[PDB]
Structure formats: C-alpha cells, structure tokens
Design a protein around this ligand. Structure first.
Ligand SMILES: CC(=O)N[C@@H]1[C@@H](O)[C@@H](O)[C@@H](CO[C@@H]2O[C@H](CO)[C@H](O)[C@H](O)[C@H]2O)O[C@@H]1O
Ligand SMILES: OC[C@H]1O[C@@H](O)[C@H](O)[C@@H](O)[C@H]1O
Ligand SMILES: OC[C@H]1O[C@@H](O)[C@H](O)[C@@H](O)[C@H]1O
Ligand SMILES: OC[C@H]1O[C@@H](O)[C@H](O)[C@@H](O)[C@H]1O
Ligand SMILES: [Ca+2]
Ligand SMILES: [Ca+2]
Ligand SMILES: [Ca+2]
Ligand SMILES: [Ca+2]
Ligand SMILES: [Mn+2]
Ligand SMILES: [Mn+2]
Ligand SMILES: [Mn+2]
Ligand SMILES: [Mn+2]
Lengths: 232, 232, 232, 232
C-alpha cells in the first residue's frame, strides 16, 4: 500500500509544504486567511504541496482517504457574508482560474461555473446563475459550482466548524460530516468516480472568494489527512 | 433539530450513561475490557445507556450521525487471538443473546449467526460457518455476522486503532474509516436502510466475545458521538 | 473525569432523552409548555432523562456544573398570573408529589411546602403560607418552597428571560444570573451542600404549577447543561 | 437602576470602545492578540474604554455582573507555552506596570507579583516565585498573581475556551466556569469584596505576557458583559 498522511495544527507562510495562491495569507495566530478583505473579487487558495497519487495506471486501483479540518467564517461591516470555502481536489498544475471574478465561482471555476476539480463547498451566498439553493448549504461539486447535490446548512459568524470527509474507493462514495455551532451535525454523501474525473496525481486544498460587495473572513484553522492506495 | 452528542475520553463503573452487559469490566486506566480472559465463550458489551431516536414515525425522517472511537486488541498466552469487536446498533432492549456461545457470534447473534442489529465488525478469526473471508477484516453487518460486505484488514496485537463512522440518512450510506498502526487507512461503505432494519428507538455500543480456545484482550478506549434528527 | 452535557435549542415529543411528567406539552414551535390552562392545580415537569452523578460516595468528590436556559411566562384571561417556574434537582426516582395541589408548591413539594429537592424558583405569586416576599422573585430552595433566600425580581408577561447557573463544588456555591427583558441582570447565590441534601444520582429539570384561579402560560424555550464529576 | 452592557463578536483597533496597551494587536480576523511573539518580556492588555461604576459611596450598594468571553492560546516553536491570560478589573487609570518583566506577572503586577486589580487568570506556566500549582490552572487573584485560590485546568493549544463569570453582589461571591476541549467544565469561586478592594469606577479587561523563553499566542475572540447597580 502507498499512504500519504499529514497534520497541521497551525500554518506558517514560510513552510514550503504548502502552495499559496492568490490573496491567501497566514496570520500570526497560525490561521490561514484565504481572502483579502480590502480587495474586490478577492481569491485565495492553498494546496498541500505534495501531489497525491489517487489512482494507479498500472492496477486501476483508486485510493481511499480520511480527512478532517476546521474552518471559520466571520462577517464584516459593511459587506454581505460571501462567498464561502471549498475543500477541493484538482490537477496538480491547478492555479486560480485566469481572469477570476471570485464571488460565486469560489476561486475554482470560470464565470460559467465550470472548472476541473472535485470538491465539498461550504457556500454562504445564493447565486442563481449557478443554481444555488436559497439558504446556506454544503455541496458536492464535480467540475462545477452548480452542485451535483447540496444540503441545507447555516454559516454562523465567528464559529469554529469541524469537518470530517471519507472517500471509499470501492463504492466511490464521498461522505461529508459538518459539526455546527448548536452542536448539530450535517451530512451529505455522493457517489463520485474520482479516477474518471481526475488525473493520476492531484493536489488537495482550500479556496475561498469574494466580490465587490461580498466579503467575509475565510479561515482555515487546521487540517489532517490520510490517503491509502492499494499497490498490489 | 433533535441532537444527541457525548464524548468519553475514558470510563468508570459508576457512570450512569453506560450500560454494562456480560463479562465487561473497567480497567484502572479507564479502558473498558469487554471479555473475561478466564471464561469459556465469554461475552461483554457496553452501551450508551440512553436510547436514541434514529428515525421518526411521524415524519419518516432518519437521523445522520458522526461517531469516532479507538479500541485495542491484544494477544494473550496462549489462546487463539479471537474473536473480535463489533460496534453495533440494536433495539433499546437489546441483551446478550440467550445461551450465547460467544466466539464468532461476537456477542450479538445466535448460533446460526443471526440477530437484530446493524454494526461494524473488526473480525480476527475466520469462521467458515459465517462465510468469513480468510484473513482478519472489517465488516458491515445487518442482522447477521455473515457480513453483507467485508474488506481485508489486519489486527495488530497491542495496537491502538482509531475509527470514524459516518451515516448519511439521505443516501442511507454507512461509511467507515479505520486508521491502522502504520498510519494506513482502510475503508468500507455500504448502503443500509436503518429505518427499514431497526425500530425508532435504539442503543449504540460495543460487543466482543471469545470461545474455549479463542481468547484475547478486547479494549474500548474512547468514544465520541453525535446524531442529529431533523424535526421542526 | 465524568461529564454529562447537552444543548436543547428546542424540544420535541418522543425524544427519549427527556422525561415528561404531568401536564407538560411540546408546542409546534419546539417550546415546552409546562402547565395545562384548563386544569385545576395543574402541574407539569420535564427532566433530563439521564441521571446525573453529582457526588461520589467512594471519593467523596462533588461535581461542578454550568447550565443556561430561557423561559417565558405569559398572562391569560381571566386567571391570576401564577404560579411560576422552578429549575430543580431531585433524586432520580422523582415524580410529581402525590395529590399535588400545584399552586405555590410549584410542583416539587407537598402542601406544607416541603420536599426532597434543590432548586431555583421564578415566583410570580406571593404565598403567605410559604413566607413569600411581597413581590415577584427569584429564590434558592433547599427541600422547601419557603426559600432559604430570595431577591426581588419581576416577571414581565411575554418577556423571554435568560438564566445562567453556576455550581462550584469546592465552595458549594450556587450562583444565578437572570437577564431580564430590559437588559438588567438579577443575581442570587447561596451555599448549598448537594452532597448533604441529595443522593449520589439525581435528575435536573423544570416544573411549573397553577391552582384553580391562578394560571398562566409557563414556557421553557431552551436549555444547555454541563456537569463534571472528577473521578481521579 | 444603572446598567452597563455590551458585546463584541469581533474587535478593531479603530474602535474607541476599547483601550489598547502595550504589544496588543488586532488580527485581520478580528481576534485580539495580546502578546507579540517576536518580543522579549512581551505584555499587552485591553480594557473597555468606558469605566464601569461597580459601587457607590452614596448608598454603599455594589453591582452584580454577568460576563462571558472566549479566548485561545496556541503553542509555537521553539518557546515554552507561556505565560497566560488574565481577565481583570482595576482602577480606571490602570497601566502596564512600569518596567514590567512580563512572564508570570501576567502584565498586571510588579516583580514581587503585587498590583491593584482583581482578576481571573488562565495560567499556563508554574512560577514558584508566586507559589503556582504544579500544573496549568485557573486562579482568582486579588491584588497579586499569588492566587487567593486555584483549580487544576488544562490549557489545550489551539482550542477555543469559553468562560462565564458571575459576581453576586449580596454574597460578594465571584464564581467562574470554564469550558474545556474535552467537553468537561471547570469552576472556581471566591468571595471578593470589590467595594473594599477596588474604587467606585473601574475598567474591565484582559492581559497576557511572555518572557525570553516563555511565549505563545494569546487571543481574545469575543466578550459580552452586563452589570446592574441598584441606585436606591
Ligand atoms: C461440539 C464440537 O464439535 N466442538 C467444536 C470444537 O471442536 C472446535 O471446532 C471449536 C472451535 O471454536 C472456534 O474457536 C476459535 C478459536 O480457536 C474462535 O473462538 C471461533 O469463533 C470459535 O467458533 O468449536 C466447538 O467447540
Ligand atoms: O453582494 C454579494 C454577492 O455579489 C455578486 O456580485 C456575486 O456574484 C456573488 O457571488 C456575491 O459575492
Ligand atoms: O389567585 C391565585 C393563587 O391562588 C391560591 O389559591 C394559590 O394557593 C396560589 O398559589 C395562586 O395560584
Ligand atoms: O520558559 C518560560 C518561563 O520563563 C521564566 O524565566 C519566567 O519567569 C516565566 O514567567 C515564563 O516566561
Ligand atoms: Ca454561491
Ligand atoms: Ca469471525
Ligand atoms: Ca409563590
Ligand atoms: Ca505563572
Ligand atoms: Mn453553492
Ligand atoms: Mn466476520
Ligand atoms: Mn417563592
Ligand atoms: Mn498562577
């Protein structure tokens, strides 16, 4: 078997173990702040520097992974609390889309909402152009911000949120669990054939965006990960 | 929103939140020891004392849940290292089956291997009478120790094992993530309609068993849990 | 350590984690209504169905606890707005006293006003037989509705009240902070030895009562709680 | 009645509602970071700009208050996680002690550990020169970091801690409740005559300090407060 595992209790701008793209910054408290509040159509992303091999061209085997992370989103005067954070998987050469308008694209898609990635978004603004639900929601995205499936959710300002994600390669199922502020959990699962949607080696990371009037604090507090690919 | 959440970092015999059944004992370090090393066909089970409402007969809604736990199995001189541990869900009046032979039944089924429960087993002995795979394995059981599905796994003597489970009510998916000694993860997921398999009120817990020749130390070290049922 | 914690933002009938006694009811809005407006000497109580271990006879240790809740009392035609609500603690076999007259007993004591419980009352009627102050008030009750101590308070019809109670086992101090509708706080603290007044296992909850002419809407809207007993 | 009440979900150095002293900085995420990680004997404090009238020389009455806050301390390399945060009350003209050495002084006392203030410390280092318990502890201090009383407590790096404090006027009791990462709650209470120990007008606030080798992230995330003084 081939395993990739890491853990971040804190983040440091200097550490090369992570790629910083766009407006991302690292606060003195070790928190990764994805977007710049004083910028229009801001976009910031972070990827685990080491590309992870999710499937073998020799066997056809796809890896399973268990990952958990905690983030925080807080409102600011005077802007709509937008746009949200998305935990994504993409080609290792992934970079913020050219001419990104941020906002509802969440830093991973073009204006039409399309891009090459698979992710779990924590959306805090209803974009009708991307067919978003009416309330805050968590969604499974496959090459588009027009979610394959979504689930009602509530983004509480200044609340630490914990997420646990399990991908089981045999059933090709991606299961998510979000632990809210009131103590309630919110789950969402979807079958997604990663090998069919993504290349052999990829990068995992987070992205967040904003617009002219849509802005809020997007923070990544921690992140643990373990992927295992059967090589036999 | 109806939620049940608890977190055991250790245990005590006087903790009312825990129902002890069979040969269960509590070690001075807070660990629960499920089987008696000196008894033939030993059986021990521990349960969260409070019955949990997993689905509504009024709305048809089914709860989602996130639960994590860590156990440890250790060989002893010089019995066969058997039989294993099973995280189960069963009717609130669940009790060790009458005339339990322990062993491959894992304390949750009858001689034929049937019973009323849903669970994730960590099997260390291949019982041909229950169609077990040839090696240790993690299984998803529904009313029977003859697993609906299993995955190859390896139980390391004296190794602390971490497990995270996610049940998504919408897709009825029960996904398990097992973190091994060497940091490798093993996963298994299966669609299981709890509403169709179990009554509205149930109890969650752990069970382990041995036989005359098959014995080993079965320890439950910690357990956190959160179930949420959408109501009104 | 042994901890019991929970958080209710609303309530629903059927939740096995709650014991309903008497005339209690759950409204469509998740609120718990303690008394029946058409019944003479009405009494309704709600208890967390999980017994809480407040002290150990083995170690002699006593638990500490933090709890918060919000309630609302609202007048009705043509009865006197009575009798009030009491947050209480009693033996786990606690039931509404047999042949209760409700009224000023607040559903936890006998006709003389005696009982086996400890609690914080929110009194809206002056019962001279129990030496009540002449106006509305918050009181600390130890085995009697004839409060060991009281502080002038005022129950505003329809006002949502917030309460926070801290019990420090070391000093045996029970402090209460009541946040009125107009933003003012009212506090009352009393040294109460729970190890000396209650058994090792108890149940927490609320009770409200009325009489023939004294009636009113008694609502419990939320309730969070955390008690910890050191077992080391 | 005279009541003061406020609430901060986020902080800003451009806001007049707060005084900033020393190395205190406000991160882009809204958190207040009390100590500078790059300075020796660092010290930073903040105070609610408006002095709170806690007692009257005309009537002798003393105010009761309920205040809760959340903070965060996180380790860093290669320094000892020190020294801690202290929520204090002091003369309205309080200032960082002249020639402060930070460290165990928590930024409120002199080298001897004496000063004019009442506070609740969250101590993460054992200074023998101040008779500190051998482990992390929460203490009630009255004009000295040589705590009047302490209770064992575990400071978890990167964990958000919630605190609730109630000062009962009549009993002159100050009781505190702290929420741990494991879920357990910790409390400590002590009788403190604010009238005798502090002036009529005071300021409430937080302070944290570090040394040459002792440094860590000291964050203040939110703070609500309500005090009521009877004027009659
Ligand atoms: C009545 C009878 O035929 N007896 C048989 C024994 O001969 C032998 O087959 C045992 C095997 O029990 C299993 O033992 C292992 C360990 O060595 C595990 O504990 C299995 O779960 C057991 O079933 O069964 C009867 O006693
Ligand atoms: O007001 C806020 C919003 O503004 C829109 O212009 C943008 O497309 C949305 O994604 C969101 O940022
Ligand atoms: O008029 C109202 C009141 O009536 C009394 O008879 C009763 O004892 C009081 O507790 C209160 O209900
Ligand atoms: O190692 C760290 C510590 O070092 C001491 O010298 C200092 O007095 C303490 O307050 C703390 O800073
Ligand atoms: Ca959107
Ligand atoms: Ca078996
Ligand atoms: Ca009365
Ligand atoms: Ca110290
Ligand atoms: Mn969306
Ligand atoms: Mn099996
Ligand atoms: Mn009274
Ligand atoms: Mn100290």
């Amino acid at each position: 078997a081939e395993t990739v595992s890491f853990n971040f209790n804190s983040f440091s701008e200097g550490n090369p173990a992570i790629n910083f793209q766009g407006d991302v910054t690292v606060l003195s408290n070790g928190n990764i702040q994805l977007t710049n509040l004083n910028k229009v159509n801001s976009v910031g992303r972070v990827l685990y520097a080491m590309p992870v091999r999710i499937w073998s061209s020799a066997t056809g085997n796809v890896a399973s992974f268990l990952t958990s992370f905690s983030f925080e989103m807080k409102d600011i005067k005077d802007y709509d609390p937008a746009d949200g954070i998305i935990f994504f998987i993409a080609p290792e050469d992934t970079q913020i889309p050219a001419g990104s308008i941020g906002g509802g694209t969440l830093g991973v898609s073009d204006t039409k909402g399309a891009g090459h990635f698979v992710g779990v978004e924590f959306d805090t603004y209803s974009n009708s152009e991307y067919n978003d639900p009416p309330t805050d929601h968590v969604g499974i995205d496959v090459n588009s911000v027009d979610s394959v499936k979504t689930v009602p959710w509530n983004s509480v300002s200044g609340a630490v949120v914990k997420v646990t994600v399990i991908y089981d390669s045999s059933t090709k199922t991606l299961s998510v669990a979000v632990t809210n502020d009131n103590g309630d959990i919110t789950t969402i699962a979807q079958v997604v054939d990663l090998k069919a949607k993504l290349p052999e080696r990829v990068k995992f990371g987070f992205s967040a965006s904003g617009s002219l009037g849509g802005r809020q604090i997007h923070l990544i507090r921690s992140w643990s990960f373990t992927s295992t690919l059967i090589t036999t």
